[PDB]
């Protein structure tokens with residue numbers, strides 16, 4: 188069992204807070220993150236712990252334990268650095284194509300793993316891909332998001348391995364263009380209607396000129412409106428892993 192008895196974790200700096208939990212930096216045999224949940228959100232707690240326990244993979248945020256006294260707390264490793272989102276869209280940081288692809292490859296490894304464990308992420312986006320120490324991808328759920336929704340998710344079960352695939356295609360888009368899709372649509376409501384209705388889809392011409400042919404192909408395959416035309420992560424992982432053998 189992975190329960191951590193009361194009194195063992197030293198709870199430090201409050202890191203961020205939301206409708207569904209508050210996260211602190213912690214000390215428990217070194218640095219951890221501690222996510223506090225209110226007593227009323229027990230079910231959420233069990234469900235989040237339930238999925239985290241199912242995972243042991245270098246590109247997934249490492250689950251370490253939980254506490255029921257005196258609070259509902261989830262304990263993960265601590266990551267240093269910032270979200271892929273922050274790297275791509277908030278910092279003049281322009282990655283090299285080799286680095287971009289390596290990020291794609293690691294994200295794909297993580298997502299491939301999650302699906303192998305029968306886990307649909309449901310909320311994949313660049314805000315949830317942590318660049319631990321600038322190098323290693325840690326996929327988790329850091330939320331406490333329409334841009335990454337498949338048309339079928341938009342329309343309102345809509346969540347599948349293939350809706351995850353689509354979100355990942357949108358991550359690919361960000362990596363390959365540096366931008367977010369639909370940057371030219373000032374209206375969130377418009378994006379929801381048009382993407383749902385079929386009317387709207389990302390402009391793939393916005394990609395870097397040094398973007399690999401195999402990657403533009405892949406991206407577009409991940410973004411297919413009919414979810415059954417989208418490829419699975421083993422294929423995706425294999426095409427990327429092949430592509431990265433451009434060394």
Ligand SMILES: CNC(=O)c1cc(Oc2ccc(NC(=O)Nc3ccc(Cl)c(C(F)(F)F)c3)cc2)ccn1
Pocket residue numbers: 202210220221222235238239242247248261263264265266267268269301306307308326327328329
């Ligand atoms: C600057 N550094 C930090 O701010 C920092 C903050 C942290 O706080 C966190 C605490 C808990 C979580 N909880 C999850 O991620 N829950 C999760 C749910 C579903 C699924 Cl599917 C998964 C998945 F995909 F991993 F399996 C994970 C995420 C982040 C951790 C490390 N570092």
